[PDB]
Design a protein around this ligand. Structure first.
Ligand code: ZN
Lengths: 10, 69
């Protein structure tokens, strides 16, 4: 199972 | 922000966590709650293991996360 993180942005 | 330091935490500077479905015919990325950490999640995680009932199934399409629509 791959995992990542992102910023709450547009 | 704007400086070389580990653990970026500040006001309005919120992080997010995503998990990819274990099925190759899915490969979908679902969002998770900010209290959850990817180092405490299963190696066989799937859409059926999601926290949000709006996307808790492999037969549900991936979300429009591209901005605001
Ligand atoms: Zn799935």
């Amino acid at each position: 199972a791959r995992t990542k993180q992102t910023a709450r942005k547009s | 922000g704007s400086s070389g330091s580990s653990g970026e935490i500040s006001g309005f500077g919120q992080c997010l966590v995503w998990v990819q479905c274990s099925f190759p015919n899915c490969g979908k990325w679902r969002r998770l709650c900010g209290n959850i950490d990817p180092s405490v999640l299963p190696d066989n995680w799937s859409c059926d293991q999601n926290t949000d009932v709006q996307y808790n199934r492999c037969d549900i399409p991936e979300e429009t996360w591209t901005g605001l629509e």
